[PDB]
């Protein structure tokens, strides 16, 4: 089995206009996976911000795989006050079994400059 991804830091504070970077950490059992970045909407619904690999049928929300293979930067570029909210990552294995596993949720606070 593979463990649900971790998502850090649990609380990330930045000033409006700067970038905010979470790290999603995930070790898969095969080469077939999609890693998704979400923000919680009103009504407890996930809004997909970005994906690795990208959805080919589809820019402030970016995912970068780090060289150790298991760590991924998930970055809000030029964060806004209204980017404040709850974020998480979801890992989807596609082989040998389709499985969806969410991380614990983290908070982003974007402060007034």
């Amino acid at each position, epitope marked *: 089995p593979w463990n649900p991804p971790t998502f850090s830091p649990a609380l990330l504070v930045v000033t409006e206009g700067d970038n905010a970077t979470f790290t999603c950490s995930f070790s898969n059992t095969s080469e077939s996976f999609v890693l998704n970045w979400y923000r919680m909407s009103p009504s407890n619904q996930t809004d997909k911000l970005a994906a690795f*690999p990208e959805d*080919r049928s589809q820019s402030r929300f970016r995912v970068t795989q780090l060289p150790n293979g298991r760590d991924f930067h998930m970055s809000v570029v030029r964060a806004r006050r209204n980017d404040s909210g709850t974020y998480l990552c979801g890992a989807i294995s596609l082989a040998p079994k*389709a499985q969806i596993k969410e991380s614990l949720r983290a908070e982003l606070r974007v402060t007034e400059r």
Partner: antibody
Amino acid sequence: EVQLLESGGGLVQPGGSLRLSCAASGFTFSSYDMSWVRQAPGKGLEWVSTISGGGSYTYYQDSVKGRFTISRDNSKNTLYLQMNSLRAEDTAVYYCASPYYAMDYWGQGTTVTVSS
Amino acid sequence: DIQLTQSPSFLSAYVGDRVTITCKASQDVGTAVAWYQQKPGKAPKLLIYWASTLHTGVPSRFSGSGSGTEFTLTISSLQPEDFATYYCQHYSSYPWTFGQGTKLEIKR
């Protein structure tokens, strides 16, 4: 634009061999799974094989295990299906496809006919 | 390994009708189910995945529902371009399998 284009299908005798290829464009090829799906004359769709983005993981329909080999050349954006010991019931249109969760992109198919 | 059976194999309807196509799995496939449309001489096109997610660029009259072993494709009101064959597929584990196809034809 994502595009997939098959080649190589034709007539082969039972027990013979054939190599299909699929050329891909419009995406980072090595980041995505690739697959083959076939459709026998008048029948439905049947998944044949999947290969992982990096090529290390391969998966096969039971009826082609030990006869078909899927492979890819990530430097040339090309998918392959090596079909050995072909059988009459391997007669089909063969589609290249690319799974993301489901197969969101497909080629146009290439026709394979296995007959004496 | 896992079998998918669609019902019916052949369905006639009028333009404007609601159409319902079912797909039964021989064991639990969670929500790892997709639906495709295929017309003669053409490759399949993806309509729905994760059993209820409408794919981008697909008309809103297509919807999917279900989880576990029972899945449904609904066309809320049929249009002339919708007469075609529809396939369900699971990707829960290997081997991936398709249903046998449902051919949607013009009633008269």
